[PDB]
Swiss-Prot record:
Protein activity control: Activated by threonine and tyrosine phosphorylation by two dual specificity kinases, MAP2K4 and MAP2K7. Inhibited by dual specificity phosphatases, such as DUSP1. Inhibited by HDAC9.
Enzyme class: transferase
UniProt membrane topology term: Lipid-anchor
Name of the featured protein: Mitogen-activated protein kinase 10
Tissue expression per record: Specific to a subset of neurons in the nervous system. Present in the hippocampus and areas, cerebellum, striatum, brain stem, and weakly in the spinal cord. Very weak expression in testis and kidney.
Domain Protein kinase: 20-303
Reported disease: A chromosomal aberration involving MAPK10 has been found in a single patient with pharmacoresistant epileptic encephalopathy. Translocation t(Y;4)(q11.2;q21) which causes MAPK10 truncation.
Top-rank lineage group of the source organism: Eukaryota
Record-level Gene Ontology MF annotations: ATP binding; JUN kinase activity; MAP kinase kinase activity; protein serine kinase activity
Catalytically driven reaction(s): L-seryl-[protein] + ATP = O-phospho-L-seryl-[protein] + ADP + H(+); L-threonyl-[protein] + ATP = O-phospho-L-threonyl-[protein] + ADP + H(+)
Amino acid sequence: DNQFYSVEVGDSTFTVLKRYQNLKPIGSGAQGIVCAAYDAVLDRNVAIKKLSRPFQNQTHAKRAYRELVLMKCVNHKNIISLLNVFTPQKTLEEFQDVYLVMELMDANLCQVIQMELDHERMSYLLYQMLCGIKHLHSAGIIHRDLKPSNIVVKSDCTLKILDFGLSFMMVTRYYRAPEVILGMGYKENVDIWSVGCIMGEMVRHKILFPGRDYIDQWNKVIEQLGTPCPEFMKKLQPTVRNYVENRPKYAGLTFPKLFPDSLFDSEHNKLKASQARDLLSKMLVIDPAKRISVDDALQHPYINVWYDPAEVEAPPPHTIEEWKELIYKEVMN
Ligand SMILES: CCCn1c(C2CCNCC2)nc(-c2ccc(Cl)c(Cl)c2)c1-c1ccnc(NC2CCCCC2)n1
Ligand SMILES: Nc1ncnc2c1ncn2[C@@H]1O[C@H](COP(=O)(O)OP(=O)(O)NP(=O)(O)O)[C@@H](O)[C@H]1O
């Protein structure tokens, strides 16, 4: 196919449409390799993600298929939007790779976490994550795995969530809600805990709960926030309830102690620091029955200054062989 050309990207070969030029590797993960490129047709820089045989197993396949479908069943500036999708392969028999194209972003939220932000930028980023999550919820999509490596930003402070969230692979749990860690039921505000973890990390410049596994994760949570109420214990399955109730007890630390003044000059900034800590205290709540909702977070004074109805109330959205065919059909449309 004359429309495509191949480029060497590390150990991988990127076979892309000739419109994408000066391919440069910008990162990789378990799912695929990402390049920056110049799109000569749009006269814009783009990010190109290659999915190598996404149908290779149930985990890669479910994710690739669910993401391809959801990216069409979603329309919001704080959620990933595709510019293009293609395969260099001509037939289902030859089908191997899927290439996804979107606007090139400047940095991920990890990089943003490593810097000091003022309250306008910090509140604007959090407002955008909430707008993004609210849009997902309105379509019945509850993320459950928001993390800063899957959130990208531009120099103008605009933000996008790259994925749609939630089993053997031949993964980052730090932002997962207690009700996800403990196999409890969950509602929309499961995503509010992850936003709290991210916000807390934006302020501390350190992962709040850096667990090597779910056991370690649960200990780091209780060591800082304290042992949850008996009413929370009442919602756990007997086995999880016995394990959680037999863990070493902790009174927990107060939010001024957790996020000291040292982490936050002018009167404006003093008031905003007070409001940021109040919002952190409402999101970083173990019990989802007592944790603030996405709607109430958007009405919080720290966030409310950015409130725009057009952004908050935007119009709402197998075997290896079967997955191969389902993914191929989605790519071909
Ligand atoms: C590669 C850096 C960030 N990124 C990732 C990561 C996410 C965490 N796991 C590893 C990959 N996926 C995409 C991405 C996700 C979905 C699609 Cl469809 C496309 Cl094409 C790209 C982008 C990205 C997206 C846009 N711009 C950028 N820009 C980089 C530039 C260098 C600094 C980090 C951000 N990365
Ligand atoms: N906020 C963080 N601070 C520091 N290190 C982190 C943080 N989050 C994740 N990491 C590390 O960054 C590395 C990449 O993590 P991650 O982006 O979650 O994986 P991934 O394969 O790129 N995800 P995906 O694209 O969804 O398949 C791992 O070594 C993590 O332990």
